[PDB]
Amino acid sequence: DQLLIVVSILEGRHFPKRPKHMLVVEAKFDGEQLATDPVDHTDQPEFATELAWEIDRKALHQHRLQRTPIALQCFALDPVTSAKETIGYIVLDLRTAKQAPKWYQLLSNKYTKFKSEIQISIALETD
Numbered sequence: 544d545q546l547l548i549v550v551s552i553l554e555g556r557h558f559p560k561r562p563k564h565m566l567v568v569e570a571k572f573d574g575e576q577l578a579t580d581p582v583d584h585t586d587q588p589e590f591a592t593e594l595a596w597e598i599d600r601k602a603l604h605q606h607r608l609q610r611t612p613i614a615l616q617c618f619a620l621d622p623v624t625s626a627k628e629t630i631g632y633i634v635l636d637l638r639t640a641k642q643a644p645k646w647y648q649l650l651s652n653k654y655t656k657f658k659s660e661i662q663i664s665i666a667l668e669t670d
Contacts (some may be wrong), residue, residue: 546569
């Protein structure tokens, strides 16, 4: 079967309310970049998106060996101008790949007084 690495980005918490702005999460794995839709920049933003990468059984073994990360980058989007500003990052571990979702703190968070976090699960699926 064709294998899928699937990252489910669920909701956020402890984010400042920015009424003119949206949030986008981008994720990159072995050079392939995916993104969520923009969602409202509330305190608990609702991403509710699955990002999935096709991978061979064999390539997956190499990546587990070298501990290849999945890099997530969180952006505040201005829908009037299309301006994106990086707000912070999250790094996911392939070894984590159903398992319960975990809450990940945004690293290098530009919202210095908020411990913003986004709940994420990662799994290996078929098809």
